[PDB]
Design a protein around this ligand. Structure first.
Ligand code: CLA
Ligand code: CLA
Ligand code: CLA
Ligand code: CLA
Ligand code: CLA
Ligand code: CLA
Ligand code: CLA
Ligand code: CLA
Ligand code: CLA
Ligand SMILES: CC1=C(/C=C/C(C)=C/C=C/C(C)=C/C=C\C=C(C)\C=C\C=C(C)\C=C\C2=C(C)C[C@@H](O)CC2(C)C)C(C)(C)CCC1
Ligand code: SF4
Ligand SMILES: [Ca+2]
Lengths: 80, 107, 39, 165, 63, 733, 144, 37
């Protein structure tokens, strides 16, 4: 499975969650940013590694980071 | 059968005049392979005067084309309904452009 | 006219004019001083 | 003289090459009438060929066994043996022109940088300013030394971005 | 009112930031205790096309 | 479910696709990444792997000796080494046609055989080998040596024989032994073989384990050696009338310093090479007594490095922390070894062709060409590997806190300056070296060869003059008969050296002109560009402005996705992959230059190269097109000749090279979608759907495709040139 | 809100079938089933290729992978303002509800959700790989 | 001396390059397809 991590730099834009095409991320209540919300990655087992979340992340540097890891039928996005 | 068609002459500079080969007919230039000489002979052109007159005609036509482009976009622009007249467009392109064009050429 | 001169001041136009000027200058020099190999 | 080369003026291969070149042009000049434009053109090329072989020899160029002029690039050999118009002088001529272009372009970028939209002045060239700098670029070498000595030519490292390391 | 003044020019110190050793303008500083309260705007866009970012008080210095 | 292969990575073992098979083979020697890997186990595995490599090398050598002694004509080549063509091995192909059998039957007939271009015939002959019995015995010995290294490999990994990590870290002790024994004693033992066997064999005397003890290497024995009258050993050397392998014109000296080459063999003197190995053996043995191991004397490498800090702070903390940096990084150690061995490999190529050490080697043009190209291509790959491991070192082993202020950390602090300067140099060389060739081509095309830019290589010619060549008239040092450097060495090597450097028929300092100047700047272009690519990869391996956290992704990763403008080929591995193309282009230019200059010298018209090498049309028509006729006629509608295998291989290399273009230009996405359609077709096809796959078929990975494409590209590159090189030289000579 | 139960006998949108449908994986490993309610019959695009007509009220479709279900989920929500839900179904009869996991779409912050894979540091505060070397396996400084 | 018979190639070449490859490929393919207990 690919390793997805969220960093304190997260601003709670929710853009990564909206960009994810496999529902690997969600917004959880937080107190570190003004938006009072931070991105979480509770379903990384369904992550394929498209890195759309990173493309949607506007922080410098990225608050969401994807590290390609062990490959599975879900990770390879195989319908067979 | 002996003279090679040539219609491009290069200026004598930095030694490039070598490209003006001895094509024949008391002429020196680059040999062309576009087939224009044979097309002009088929059309019945026998003088450089006829080629010069057609050249002037083409520029008059080029000026007309650029005018048409400006006029049909800035002055009288056809509406979508006009462009969506496919039945009319095919009738004119088959009968006028193609059939009339072929009839005129036969003339 | 001001907009037209601004268009003539656009990168491509200036490049064409400047390069045409530079090319011309070099060509004319070789036209009057042919085969220049050494100073 | 140097490297065992020989003056083109005394090389036999240099002389044979000039004859070989003129004989090709002459073999062609025959198929044409004397006043024919083709004949006039081949004659002007033959005159230009004769002048080149003569001008190159007069310039004191050295020729290898191939009978072709070789250029001496060592500043020491060129100055001591009369071969400085081959690489040395050309070097200072190019360096002046190339620095001219660079210093003017740098002066332009610096001037447009203090404007409202520098990016706009890079796609649309401020011609009047550009022409002014183009003329003032003749004294670039002295300006470049004066900038190097005031410490205004370079940027402070603290103001230049770099990767994490 | 902690943080640099609004409209002031500060130089970024975040190493992984695209504007490291570069100067931007202080858009606003969040008085609330957020980890990064300084909003800085830059003229040059980053590789992502962004021209703004949040930094901590320590990550910025008047310059 | 979890498959057994690979056992070193559960991740791959749990991959249900075909990628598991490819990655299991691709990551088998990356021990550091294997599951449950410890530093000590890492060292022990490498130690055993090194014994395995040695076993393979010795079997390869034994195999070579056996096939020559069993299928070649060594006992016939020795009789006439000028006109007899050496046989590599016999050809048993049942697909051959009767004509092909006849075309390949040669070298004393005995059926279809391949001619050898390796140079082992001249090598073994020079070292004293004279019979197939000698070759057979050597083969057996080396086969036995291979088995011992294979056993040692197995044993030094078994319990009670597994060396500790501390033993692997004992640098001062390992270097002392390798310098004094591996290098010094080995060279000394070689001097003994040359003096006791090779030189007697060259003088017509057989000296083997049967009579080596009852034979005297020198008439005065060791009395000169122990009395100090060493000069005695240099008295009465072989004369110019010495017929190699016989006592005709043969002298009695064992160690000399004649210099130059033996008149008949056109190779270096055995007495000069014996004295060379003796001198270097002494130097190495002494050098091996510099580091402290157990007796209270010697240097501590850490103390040496820690002391080397310029007092002005120009190098920061100097070499502080570098001992531990190098001692704890196998990648750093491998980077240095490759960089050194690779440079040494190129030296072997440059020195072996200019100063041929083996008899009748310079007359075998095909072998001369093959050896130079072979070593120059192996050198190029090794150099690429060195930087690759330097980039890996930075990502996996480099610890900034332990290298703070040191020369290594300083490099990273000015990487932009280093890269930007390598960029400038490469640009200058590229624009001017290309511009001058194009100018010359246009001048040749317009029929004005006197107008071409022909800069004389005066600086190189001045060096050649310094070495003795008087053709340039610079008159200085060895070119000046009134110079001290000339007088001091007049009674030593100069005479023989000056005769050779002034002979324009050998390859000793060939004459050079404007064509050599242009190609040398082309070589400089390639070296700087390939270094720019490799250096930029190592310096940016840990991070850049586009990817500041690259170190967290490792040496090899596909990309960072299309975000941030696009990040294809951003890894340091991607830099190595791009550098290989430039390395092959560089070695291509260098090998083309060497081959063309030698083909013209061998043919006897150096003027062709001197007048055609100054324009690229000359290279394409006077070198490639002209020298390809006989090769492409290896097989034709009128029949085939011995050059048929080379014609077939030449085209075989073009095919593999172009197949690489598909893996290099077309990318995964397109193929993955095509395979999915095939998976549907197989599952929807009756009877076919009865059989199924254990590994889900998938397109090759991005990194895998770059490697497979580069491999196909590199294999075709080598096979095509090797086929052209051997065919052109052999067919023409 | 409670975890929904998948009714497998739900009417499926009108569609003549295609060649981009389920494969042997659906019978051996697992398949995905999207369900939604339609207030009107509307033609829509099958993520596997082709046009299909959603039926009034309940609708059910089966896809080979989760991405295809979420792709259809995106179109129905963005274009038709519908609220679909999908599940992973195993070959042994087991059904697993997947999205929206808590009944509230992930982009909308919801209570109860506990953060996962979150690092209380910026990426530039990650350690050097030399520190995470010789661990149980190949890992990244980010994982620590 | 250490000389194989004339039939050596007529037998060694067939075995090495056809027979042995097949045997190697067979065992290798089996191991890869085998799954961990
Ligand atoms: C002096 C006459 C004139 C003027 C002042 C304008 C002015 C304008 N036109 Mg216009 N037009 C004209 C003549 C003119 N046109 C003619 C004769 C035609 C028929 C072809 C058109 C067809 C036309 C169209 C279809 C459109 C405009 C549009 C516009 C407006 C913006 C586009 C523009 O001009 O930017 C300047 C653009 C250029 C300078 C590009 C020049 C294009 C030339 C013809 C290409 C030449 C290429 C060359 C032959 C080959 C290059 C090869 C390479 C190796 C060098 C603008 C107010 C656009 C608009 O309405 O705004 C959205 C619009 O879509 N014009
Ligand atoms: C006899 C009627 C007729 C003729 C001869 C043409 C001829 C042509 N039409 Mg056309 N068209 C017509 C009727 C006609 N159309 C009608 C009734 C409609 C409305 C349904 C259209 C709508 C239409 C569209 C949308 C387009 C054309 C286009 C074209 C040109 C295609 C280029 C080509 O292949 O020819 C080769 C070119 C030549 C042989 C050069 C000779 C052309 C001269 C001027 C012939 C005159 C044609 C013109 C219709 C005559 C009236 C001009 C008058 C108003 C001043 C072509 C010259 C294309 C175009 O853009 O052209 C600019 C195009 O996109 N036509
Ligand atoms: C780095 C590459 C390079 C270099 C150094 C040169 C150098 C030269 N080329 Mg050349 N050329 C090149 C590339 C290059 N070329 C390429 C790639 C092509 C193919 C397109 C050509 C095609 C070409 C042709 C066809 C000819 C040359 C010629 C020449 C010579 C004319 C010098 C001159 O103009 O007088 C001196 C000019 C000046 C002193 C003016 C300096 C510029 C400004 C105005 C001065 C301001 C000073 C303050 C010269 C030595 C000509 C020649 O006769 O060869 C001997 C000529 O016929 N070149
Ligand atoms: C950039 C590389 C380079 C290289 C490889 C050379 C190489 C050479 N130069 Mg040199 N030179 C260079 C750059 C270079 N130069 C530059 C940039 C300048 C501008 C100042 C000069 C100015 C120069 C002069 C004035 C002379 C040479 C000379 C020479 C030749 C002998 C010089 C020597 O002994 O050692 C090599 C030299 C260098 C590595 C650097 C510069 C040369 C030194 C400073 C000159 C000392 C020469 C000395 C008197 C030895 C010659 C004795 C006698 C024959 C005069 C030699 C082949 C001598 C010569 O042969 O003239 C006929 C000569 O007198 N060069
Ligand atoms: C006299 C003591 C001695 C000797 C002879 C050796 C010898 C060797 N050790 Mg070693 N070692 C020693 C002590 C010694 N060690 C001690 C005390 C320690 C503990 C500190 C170690 C720890 C150690 C380790 C950890 C390793 C070795 C390894 C090796 C092998 C290196 C493999 C190789 O590169 O091929 C031979 C190298 C040479 C012959 C050097 C010469 C290379 C030059 C450049 C070639 C030039 C040849 C000539 C110019 C042209 C030839 C032409 C023609 C003949 C082809 C080598 C045979 C490695 C190994 O195990 O491999 C299996 C390795 O991993 N040793
Ligand atoms: C003493 C020399 C030496 C040693 C000990 C190592 C050791 C190592 N290297 Mg390395 N390397 C070397 C030299 C060396 N290298 C050289 C000279 C180069 C330049 C070519 C490289 C370039 C290099 C790269 C780019 C990489 C390594 C990597 C590695 C590590 C794991 C890779 C591996 O071995 O897996 C197994 C290796 C293979 C399975 C070989 C792959 C197949 C290739 C394409 C050969 C195929 C040729 C084919 C047979 C041709 C057929 C022709 C025929 C039909 C006629 C490993 C510790 C990798 C790494 O850093 O780990 C992450 C890595 O990325 N090396
Ligand atoms: C014939 C093929 C070819 C050529 C010509 C080049 C050339 C170059 N490569 Mg390259 N490379 C190639 C293939 C090639 N490569 C391949 C197949 C690969 C593997 C994918 C690489 C991978 C590679 C890497 C990784 C790098 C390079 C780099 C470079 C540049 C090195 C600096 C230099 O020499 O400046 C000399 C400049 C020239 C030779 C260009 C000549 C100038 C032009 C021709 C004159 C203009 C003509 C005319 C005026 C206008 C023409 C256009 C017209 C439409 C108006 C150089 C321009 C390095 C680099 O980027 O430099 C920093 C580098 O990093 N290459
Ligand atoms: C010389 C280089 C080369 C070669 C040989 C091929 C070959 C092929 N390409 Mg390809 N391609 C190339 C370059 C090349 N390409 C490049 C540079 C690009 C970039 C644009 C592409 C992009 C590309 C695309 C986009 C596609 C292909 C496709 C195909 C396949 C078409 C179907 C087919 O003919 O199957 C038959 C196989 C052959 C004709 C190869 C002949 C090999 C010989 C005759 C067989 C000998 C076997 C031998 C005896 C085995 C024993 C060896 C022994 C050691 C055991 C085919 C195998 C298409 C595809 O995937 O397939 C449908 C496809 O869509 N190519
Ligand atoms: C790395 C060393 C090496 C290499 C490269 C070769 C290569 C070769 N051997 Mg050989 N061989 C070797 C060592 C080696 N041998 C040793 C040490 C012995 C002593 C036991 C032999 C005994 C031997 C015999 C008796 C024969 C060969 C034959 C052959 C050729 C047939 C090719 C084949 O696959 O069939 C057989 C390959 C082998 C038997 C050796 C396997 C080596 C592969 C390439 C690894 C081939 C070119 C045959 C031959 O001569 O064909 C004309 C043959 O009859 N070899
Ligand atoms: C002012 C100017 C600019 C230049 C800016 C800068 C900082 C340029 C940097 C220059 C630097 C750091 C140069 C550093 C080292 C240079 C060295 C050591 C000089 C080497 C030259 C040598 C050895 C001479 C070689 C020869 C001479 C005598 C001339 C010829 O005969 C040829 C040859 C090779 C024989 C800007 C902005 C690019 C814009 C533009 C104008
Ligand atoms: S890489 Fe793709 S699947 Fe994974 S979390 Fe990011 S957007 Fe979602
Ligand atoms: Ca013997």
């Amino acid at each position: 499975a690919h390793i997805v991590k969220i960093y304190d730099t997260c601003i709670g834009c929710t853009q990564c969650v909206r960009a994810c095409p496999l529902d690997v991320l969600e917004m959880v209540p937080w107190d570190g940013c003004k938006a009072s919300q931070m991105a979480s990655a509770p379903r990384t087992e369904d992550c394929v590694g498209c890195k759309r979340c990173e493309t949607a992340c506007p922080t410098d540097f990225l608050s969401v980071r994807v590290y390609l890891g062990s490959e599975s039928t879900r990770s390879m996005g195989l319908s067979y | 059968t002996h003279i090679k068609p040539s219609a491009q002459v290069v200026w004598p500079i930095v030694g490039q005049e070598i490209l003006n080969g001895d094509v024949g007919g008391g002429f020196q230039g680059i040999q062309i392979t576009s087939g224009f000489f044979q097309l002009w002979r088929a059309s019945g052109i026998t003088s450089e005067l006829q080629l010069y007159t057609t050249a002037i005609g083409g520029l008059v036509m080029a000026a007309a084309m650029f005018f048409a482009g400006w006029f049909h976009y800035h002055k009288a622009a056809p509406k979508l309904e006009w462009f969506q007249n496919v039945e009319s467009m095919l009738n004119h392109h088959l009968g006028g452009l193609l059939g009339l064009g072929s009839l005129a050429w036969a003339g | 006219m001001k907009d037209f001169t601004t268009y003539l001041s656009t990168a491509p136009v200036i490049a064409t004019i400047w390069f045409t000027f530079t090319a011309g200058l070099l060509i004319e020099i070789n036209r009057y001083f042919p085969d220049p190999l050494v100073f | 003289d140097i490297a065992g080369l020989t003056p083109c003026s005394e090389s036999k291969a240099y002389a044979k090459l000039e004859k070989k070149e003129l004989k090709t042009l002459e073999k062609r000049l025959k198929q044409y009438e004397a006043d024919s434009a083709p004949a006039v053109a081949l004659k002007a090329t033959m005159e230009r060929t004769k002048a080149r072989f003569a001008n190159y020899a007069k310039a004191g160029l050295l020729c290898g066994n191939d009978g072709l002029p070789h250029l001496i690039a060592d500043p020491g050999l060129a100055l001591k043996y009369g071969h400085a118009g081959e690489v040395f002088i050309p070097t200072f001529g190019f360096l002046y022109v190339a620095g001219y272009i660079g210093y003017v372009g740098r002066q332009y970028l610096i001037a447009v940088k203090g404007e409202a939209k520098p990016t706009d002045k890079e796609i649309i060239i401020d011609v009047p300013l550009a022409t002014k700098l183009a003329w003032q670029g003749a004294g670039w070498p002295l300006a470049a030394v004066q900038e190097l000595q005031r410490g205004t030519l370079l940027e402070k490292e603290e103001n230049i971005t770099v990767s994490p390391r | 009112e902690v943080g640099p003044k609004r409209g002031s020019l500060v130089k970024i110190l975040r190493p992984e930031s695209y504007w490291f050793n570069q100067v931007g303008k202080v858009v606003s500083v969040d008085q609330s205790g957020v980890r990064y309260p300084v909003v800085v705007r830059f003229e040059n866009q980053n590789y992502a096309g962004v021209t703004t970012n949040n930094y901590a008080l320590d990550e910025v210095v008047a310059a | 479910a979890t498959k057994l292969f690979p056992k070193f990575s559960q991740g791959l073992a749990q991959d249900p696709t075909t990628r598991r098979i490819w990655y299991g083979l691709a990551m088998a020697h990356d021990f550091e990444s294997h599951d449950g890997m410890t530093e000590e186990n890492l060292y022990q595995k490498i130690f055993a792997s090194h014994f395995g490599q040695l076993s393979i090398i010795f079997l390869w050598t034994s195999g070579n000796l056996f096939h020559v002694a069993w299928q070649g004509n060594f006992e016939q080549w020795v009789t006439d080494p000028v006109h007899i063509r050496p046989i590599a091995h016999a050809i048993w192909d049942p697909h051959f046609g009767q004509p092909a059998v006849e075309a390949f039957t040669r070298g004393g007939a005995s059926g279809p055989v391949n001619i050898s271009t390796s140079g082992v015939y001249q090598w073994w002959y020079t070292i004293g080998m004279r019979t197939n019995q000698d070759l057979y015995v050597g083969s057996v010995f080396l086969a036995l040596v291979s088995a011992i290294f294979l056993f040692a490999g197995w044993l030094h990994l078994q319990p009670n024989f597994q060396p500790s990590l501390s033993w692997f870290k004992d640098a001062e002790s390992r270097l002392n032994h390798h310098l004094s024994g591996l290098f010094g004693v080995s060279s000394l033992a070689w001097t003994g073989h040359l003096v006791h066997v090779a030189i007697p064999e060259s003088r017509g005397q057989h000296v083997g384990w049967d009579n080596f003890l009852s034979v005297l290497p020198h008439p005065q024995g060791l009395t000169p050696f122990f009395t100090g009258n060493w000069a005695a050993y240099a008295q009465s050397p072989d004369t110019a009338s010495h017929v190699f392998g016989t006592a005709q014109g043969s002298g009695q000296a064992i160690l000399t310093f004649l210099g130059g080459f033996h008149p008949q063999t056109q190779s270096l003197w055995l007495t000069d090479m014996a004295h060379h190995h003796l001198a270097i053996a002494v130097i190495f043995i002494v050098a091996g007594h510099m580091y402290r191991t157990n007796f209270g004397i010697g240097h501590r490498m850490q103390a040496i490095l820690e002391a080397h800090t310029p007092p002005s702070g120009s190098l920061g903390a100097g070499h502080k922390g570098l001992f531990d940096t190098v001692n704890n990084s196998l990648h750093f150690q491998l980077g240095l070894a490759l960089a050194s061995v690779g440079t040494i490999t190129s030296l072997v190529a440059q020195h072996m062709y200019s100063l041929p050490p083996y008899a009748f080697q310079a007359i075998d043009f095909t072998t001369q060409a093959a050896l130079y190209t072979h070593h120059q291509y192996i050198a190029g790959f090794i150099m690429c590997g060195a930087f690759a491991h330097g980039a890996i070192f930075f990502i996996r082993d480099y610890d900034p806190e332990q290298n703070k202020g040191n020369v290594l950390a300083r490099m990273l602090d000015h990487k932009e300056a280093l890269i930007s300067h390598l960029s400038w140099v490469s640009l200058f060389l590229g624009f001017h070296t290309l511009g001058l060739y194009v100018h010359n081509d246009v001048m040749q095309a317009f029929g004005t060869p006197e107008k071409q830019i022909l800069i004389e290589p005066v600086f190189a010619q001045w060096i050649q003059a310094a070495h003795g060549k008087a053709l340039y008239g610079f008159d200085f040092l060895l070119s000046s008969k009134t110079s001290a450097a000339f007088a001091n060495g007049q009674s030593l090597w100069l005479p023989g050296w000056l005769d050779a450097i002034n002979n324009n028929q050998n390859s000793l300092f060939l004459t050079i002109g404007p064509g050599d100047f242009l190609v040398h700047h082309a070589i400089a272009l390639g070296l700087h560009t390939t270094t720019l690519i490799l250096v930029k990869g190592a310096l940016d391996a840990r991070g850049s402005k586009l990817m500041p956290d690259k170190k967290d992704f490792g040496y090899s990763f596909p990309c960072d996705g299309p975000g941030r403008g696009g990040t294809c080929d951003i890894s340091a591995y991607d830099a190595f992959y791009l550098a290989v193309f430039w390395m092959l282009n560089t070695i291509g230019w260098v090998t083309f230059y060497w081959h063309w200059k030698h083909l013209t010298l061998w043919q006897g018209n150096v003027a062709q190269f001197d007048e055609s090498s100054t324009y690229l049309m000359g290279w394409l028509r006077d070198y490639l097109w002209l020298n390809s006729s006989q090769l492409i006629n290896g097989y034709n509608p009128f029949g085939m000749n011995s050059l048929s295998v080379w014609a077939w291989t030449f085209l075989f290399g073009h095919l593999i090279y172009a197949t690489g273009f598909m893996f290099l230009i077309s990318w995964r996405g397109y193929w993955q979608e095509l395979i999915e359609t095939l998976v549907w077709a197989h599952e929807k096809t009756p009877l076919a759907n009865l059989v199924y796959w254990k590994d889900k078929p998938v397109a090759l990975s991005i990194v895998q495709a770059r490697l497979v494409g580069l491999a196909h590209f590199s294999v075709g590159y080598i096979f095509t040139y090797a086929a052209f090189l051997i065919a052109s030289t052999s067919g023409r000579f | 809100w409670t975890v929904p139960t998948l009714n497998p006998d739900t009417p499926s949108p009108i569609f003549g079938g295609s060649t981009g449908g389920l494969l042997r994986k659906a019978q051996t490993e697992e398949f995905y089933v999207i369900t939604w309610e339609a207030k009107k019959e509307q033609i829509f695009e099958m993520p596997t290729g082709g046009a299909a007509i959603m039926r009034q009220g309940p609708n059910l479709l089966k896809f080979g992978k989760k991405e295809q279900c979420l792709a259809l989920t995106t179109q129905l929500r963005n274009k038709f303002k519908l609220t679909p839900c999908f599940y992973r179904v195993f070959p042994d009869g087991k059904v697993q509800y997947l999205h929206p996991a808590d009944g509230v779409y992930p982009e909308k912050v919801n209570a109860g959700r506990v953060g996962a894979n979150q690092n209380m540091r910026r990426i530039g505060q990650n350690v050097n790989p030399i520190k995470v070397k010789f661990s149980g396996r190949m890992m990244s400084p980010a994982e620590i | 001396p250490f000389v194989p018979p004339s039939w050596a190639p007529s037998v060694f070449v067939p075995l090495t390059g056809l027979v042995l490859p097949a045997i190697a490929m067979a065992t290798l393919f089996v191991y890869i397809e085998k799954e961990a207990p």
